[model samples]
Target: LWPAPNEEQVTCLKMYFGHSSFKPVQWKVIHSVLEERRDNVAVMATGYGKSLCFQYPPVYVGKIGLVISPLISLMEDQVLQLKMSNIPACFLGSAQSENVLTDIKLGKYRIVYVTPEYCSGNMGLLQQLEADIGITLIAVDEAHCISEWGHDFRDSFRKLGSLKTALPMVPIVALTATASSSIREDIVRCLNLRNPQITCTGFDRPNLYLEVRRKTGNILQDLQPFLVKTSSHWEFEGPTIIYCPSRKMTQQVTGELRKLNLSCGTYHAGMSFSTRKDIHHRFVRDEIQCVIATIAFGMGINKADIRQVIHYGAPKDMESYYQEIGRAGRDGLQSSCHVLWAPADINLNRHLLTEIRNEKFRLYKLKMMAKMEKYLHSSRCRRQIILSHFEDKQVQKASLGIMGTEKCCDNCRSRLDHGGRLEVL
Candidate 1:
């Protein structure tokens, strides 16, 4: 059984935040994990501090914490941040050497972050951790990916449910920033969580203004108007990010933006690791005004002052689009999210999905595309539409329909006359 947070644990919380109390959701979720000794599923928005859920528990109940992450880039950034803060953290990934894996297998670190792909491959390593070190807690980040019903489905994620069978008594916590009602149910089923406590902080970002412009098959032509209208007069302000659906589109857009004398760089997984790191550094230092890249560019990036996020092409799904756009204006400042939507983009996505030999994966991709179309055509309060999909409550509005109390989206902006909403001709 998992132990409750004792007086010592409370002190650690105070030391970490210089406060005597935990946030309402934090207190409730922690209490559920400790007192009930039940597994949990937490769906909170970006910047909502999801790490605290797993971080605090290990200090009280176990000697080590095993974090299963989806992306190596995210794992590396997280481990580095923890080390800088003087926390004992390590990670295992494709970049690590055999010596490093040996150390990890020896259970030398207090907190170890690893990808599910690697963890699943070395079942013997996990068995050792279970037999020798006693892994009391297992935390799954981006848990939605495990659900076949979820937009970001991954086959490797499905294997995590077996861990419950392998270590039946270990308390597990599945964490994600987004999940619909159906997806939430699927997560519980997939992870085999036993009477799991579910917590959702809602999905609303009123400060983020959303605008979707129908593409005219000419991205440059569609983007010019939005740029001229929003940033024609600004100088030396916050940085911007432009996400493209493909490397080819990323290069094309970067070329056009460069002609405008804007300081920018392109990034994609296809580029060398050093080149990607350099571009990331330049963008973080404010040395560049914008970055044109594929979705891979923003996984572990935690910049708080991003002024805008523009999508040169529509994303594969609403969940993906929402997550990527949430990276903007993380400081809770005014920011804009622009998407150049083309119906043809959907066909391209479908074609890519068909190429996947895995039937389950192909179906998941198709479902994701359908949801993206629904979000694009939604006429209700955009915030409400997203929140409702994630099984959160909302308030009805006079003009915008149901509005989530958090942050109004661009559809709500249209009702408020914010000038961000666009209608296709």
Candidate 2:
């Protein structure tokens, strides 16, 4: 199911990203774009190097490439790193030079990143780039945003379907770390993808050990020791992110962490952009070792050494849960993700879902929550349950190679034979 890379393909990757070889899924994605020239929806986990899939074709063919991102901050981060690598990348956003547009049209950069809102209003620029420089690919980095069924739905992303009609011949690559079956269908239909080659390059992050526990009335008390022990463990050597379901919970968790004398901060949507920006920058720079936050804080942080992710409440949906837990172990080392939930957490989620006015969208979210509820109650391997939710088969094959000492998950430890030490894959 993998493409055989010729010397040129390997040499190009080595020349640009300095990788000796491509990951299996990356090769498949690059092959689809550079050779097959077909539309593709790639569902790869975070830190799996999805960017290279889109970045490769433009460099190989000497053409322009466009990346549609949901966040201006993410765009800034990506473009900065690309420029640092001498990859010729720029972004279209506020405070740009007067000649940026002119340079873009001249194909001075190999890749350009833009927010969907920016991309939506500037369709003329995209069409012009296609006409003059020839865009080899248009990669929608967070493709799940286009679907109403997705956890993070945005109207601006929904408008991206127009890109297909505008440049019908240009291959569109939709990439996301997590997308359920219905979300995938929505992505394909919204983009009008023609027989798109879909791939899920496995959801199992082998280094992450998943755990869930019933939350007692004294959650802070119940949680304190575990947090202390894990943070002190040499194996979990990086900062921690504790996820609260709401702004209020974030404050409470921040206070509790203070009681434990752990240096930390709080982040949520309520903060001013500058304040949020400060906290984000400080955390990434290791000024703080932990931060309590809502979902708003997860997608933006690209730090690779996040050692643990603690969910203080039941996640609203499985996709969001998987996506949030993925924030840990991105450095490809051992990390832990723990979920502490009470029944009231589910009730709170239900209350919020009722506030959504659209009947169909509301119903879809409720159904997704039901799956989360099932996961909460299940006693099976937590990793298996998560992999099953994404409908990825690679979990089964990976299960055969579980490291001996570290149990893959808590449920497996409690129910299955737990004996040998686990190696970092």
Best by TM-score: 2
**Clash list (residue pairs), candidate 2:** 404-420, 404-421, 405-420, 405-421, 405-422
Off by over 4 Å in 1: 1-23, 34-36, 59-62, 93-107, 121-124, 127-132, 151-155, 177-182, 216-221, 225-237, 270-277, 296-300, 346-370, 392-411, 416-425
lDDT of 1 by residue, 1-425 (tens): 33445687688777643547666667667777655667988887756667777766655554567889876666666665566555567786677888977776576665778889887776677777878777757899888889766657889998888888887877788887665677778888898999888887766666777777788766557666545433564232457788888878878887777666767877665454456557667877888878776764333245778888888777766666777787888777888887777777843367667578878867767876887777777766666566665553443443242342224565655655654433322
Task: Report the Cα lDDT for candidate 1.
Answer: 0.70
* Deviation of model 1 at 274, angstroms: 4.6
Which candidate comes out best when scored by lDDT? 2
Tens digit of per-residue lDDT, candidate 2, span 1-425: 65599998788888888889888888888899888889999989756778899988998888998999876665665676677677899988656787988888888999888888988988887898999999999999788888876767888888898998999989999997664688889999998899998887876678888888888787567466455455543111458888888887878777766666667877655455457567768878988788777863332355678888888888867777887888788888888888888777853377877678888887777787787888888876677777776763334524546522345788766654555333457
Q: What TM-score, computed on C-alpha atoms, does each candidate reach?
A: 0.79, 0.83
